[PDB]
Write a protein that binds this ligand. Structure first.
Ligand SMILES: Nc1cc(Cn2c(C(=O)O)c(-c3ccc[nH]c3=O)c3cc(C(F)(F)F)ccc32)ccn1
Length: 563
């Protein structure tokens, strides 16, 4: 069937859309080639519509059926809980899109009578009605990139009342079931330090390793109605409350498999028969589907001792090499099986014989040295998109601060330490906003974090070595330096000067600011301060941080204030 059908009504914006990076003094201190930075808008939605619209031909075989039964046997160990309305309301982001039924996210979080009454009526309707397609809104996503232009991605999501109900029926399932089924292959259970440990240990565990990343073209569009019902067959192996079983059945038929698309103007836009990007099950569903297809494809290809690491549609496979020619042929056979399963590649996969050459989750393993000169593996990535987005976020107040998420996840990197920490600490200190909580996203969930808590967060996620790395690889240094020239970012010598300045100011303030000056900026001075474990680090409650993926799932993970 066609992934989408369209009526001809346009994908419309709800307000004015900015596509150009503003010319602002603060963003210009970071990045001077402003014309290279752009934001996607609904103006390019028709280009995206053409790309995502195609017929799927799916052919399943015994390898696929065998893997599925093995996955279901593991899912059969899970007992999932129904969340109460209050628990589901507390998981709603404060700025989540308001309902069309007269209430918004603040009303949901406050358990207002109107929000609660409407959520209760939506829940009862899921229990009673197994068939009526649930309406969804389609919007073009506003995302920032550097030139060389991408068309806007499309987001499809149901009303606020439905999203609260999805959490009630499925939040516990999507949070616990993926690790139960996929074990060590489930990527979202790892902090960045654990992910690098898993990759390095997996690579080193092979007698002669070969690895490859597999990029599916327009993954959500390749997901079939059969794939979504197969995904439901896995959820149904859980021990579930009867209302949760019915809600999952109803949500699968009325929402997950497909449904009508409405634009921001309320006009009927078309019909979807593939994965919706904005539902609670998107991450879990994509991860399970990708794992199932790849596991089965590995068997069809006769790839030996395969270890997968999956996060949504992002897949990396590490296996036992059979020689370059045999691997080359087995990888073509893997791609052929993935294509039969309706997961064709975007770029054909390439066999890799060096772990640092593999790019997975846009990131690669690199090596630096700690204070003792000991090799430390860590994950890095090309800093182009992070810097372009940090420039945008400096010029415009944005709901999600990718710069903050990037400092947290890429804390050991040369570019996060020298540029992002320096730039934002300098601005926030000048604004007396170091203690102001900002929103960022980790594995798709929203967190409210104060920049002053960064040292202890970084220590937990990466270890104290995140504050001592030096002797970065020439390849990593060249990539950063070349990115700075391309974007017109001041050179690393300028960042060192600026860091010494903000470090001095931070130390002069004492308290949490001085801890930031000591730990975050020790790289900027020859006279190193002694770095010991931060007491606050062991006290941090990072439960929920690296458990599961929630992209598009409308999840907020910071504490709810009492009432
Ligand atoms: N492109 C992708 C990424 C993922 C998963 N993912 C995300 C994500 O946005 O979900 C981040 C991630 C990066 C920055 C801020 N917040 C985050 O969550 C991240 C960072 C690392 C690491 F390299 F830093 F370890 C590894 C995997 C990561 C899944 C599918 N496609």
């Amino acid at each position: 069937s066609m992934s989408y059908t369209w009526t001809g009504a346009l994908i419309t914006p709800c307000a004015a859309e900015e596509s150009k990076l503003p010319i602002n003094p603060l963003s210009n201190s970071l990045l001077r080639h402003h014309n290279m930075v752009y934001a996607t808008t609904s103006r390019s939605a028709s280009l995206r519509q053409k790309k995502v619209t195609f017929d799927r031909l799916q052919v399943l075989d015994d390898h696929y059926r065998d893997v599925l039964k093995e996955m279901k046997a593991k899912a059969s160990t899970v007992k999932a809980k129904l969340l109460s309305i209050e628990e589901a309301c507390k998981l709603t982001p404060p700025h989540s899109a308001k309902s069309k039924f007269g209430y918004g996210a603040k009303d949901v979080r406050n358990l207002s009578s109107r929000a609660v009454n409407h959520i209760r009526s939506v829940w009862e309707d899921l229990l009673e009605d197994t068939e009526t397609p649930i309406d969804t809104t389609i919007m073009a996503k506003s995302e920032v990139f550097c030139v060389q232009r991408k068309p806007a991605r499309l987001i499809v999501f149901p009303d606020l009342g439905v999203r609260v109900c999805e959490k009630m029926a499925l939040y516990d399932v999507v949070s616990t079931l993926p690790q139960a089924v996929m074990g060590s292959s489930y990527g979202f259970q790892y902090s960045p330090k654990q992910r690098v440990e898993f990759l390095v240990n997996t690579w080193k565990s092979k007698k002669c390793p070969m690895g490859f990343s597999y990029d599916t073209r327009c993954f959500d569009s390749t997901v079939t109605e059969s794939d979504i019902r197969v995904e439901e067959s896995i959820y149904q192996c859980c021990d579930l409350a009867p209302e949760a079983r019915q809600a999952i059945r109803s949500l699968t038929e009325r929402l997950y498999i497909g449904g009508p698309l409405t634009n921001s103007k309320g006009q009927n836009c078309g019909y979807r028969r593939c994965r919706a990007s904005g539902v609670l099950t998107t991450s879990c569903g994509n991860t399970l589907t990708c794992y199932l297809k790849a596991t089965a494809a590995c068997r069809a290809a006769k790839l030996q001792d395969c270890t997968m690491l999956v996060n949504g549609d992002d897949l990396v496979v590490i296996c036992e090499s059979a020689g370059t020619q045999e691997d080359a042929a087995a990888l073509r056979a893997f791609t052929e099986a993935m294509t039969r399963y309706s997961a064709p590649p975007g770029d054909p996969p390439q066999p890799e014989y060096d772990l640092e050459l593999i790019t997975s989750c846009s990131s690669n393993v690199s090596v630096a040295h700690d204070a003792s000169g000991k090799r430390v593996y860590y994950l890095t990535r090309d800093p182009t998109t992070p810097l372009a987005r940090a420039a945008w976020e400096t010029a415009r107040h944005t709901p999600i601060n990718s710069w903050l998420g990037n400092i947290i996840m890429y804390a050991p990197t040369l570019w996060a330490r020298m540029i992002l920490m320096t730039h934002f600490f300098s601005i926030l200190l000048a604004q007396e906003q170091l203690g102001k909580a900002l929103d960022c996203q980790i594995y798709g969930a929203c967190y409210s974090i104060e920049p002053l808590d960064l040292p202890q967060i970084i220590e937990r996620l990466h270890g104290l070595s995140a504050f001592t790395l030096h002797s970065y690889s020439p390849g990593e240094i060249n990539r950063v330096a070349s990115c700075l020239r391309k974007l017109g970012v001041p050179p690393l010598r300028t960042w060192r000067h600026r860091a010494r300045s903000v470090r001095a100011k931070l130390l002069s303030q004492g308290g949490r600011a001085a801890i930031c000056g000591r730990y975050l900026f020790n790289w900027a001075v020859r006279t190193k301060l002694k770095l010991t474990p931060i007491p606050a680090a062991s006290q941090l409650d990072l439960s929920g941080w690296f458990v599961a993926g929630y992209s598009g799932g409308d999840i907020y993970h910071s504490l709810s204030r009492a009432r």
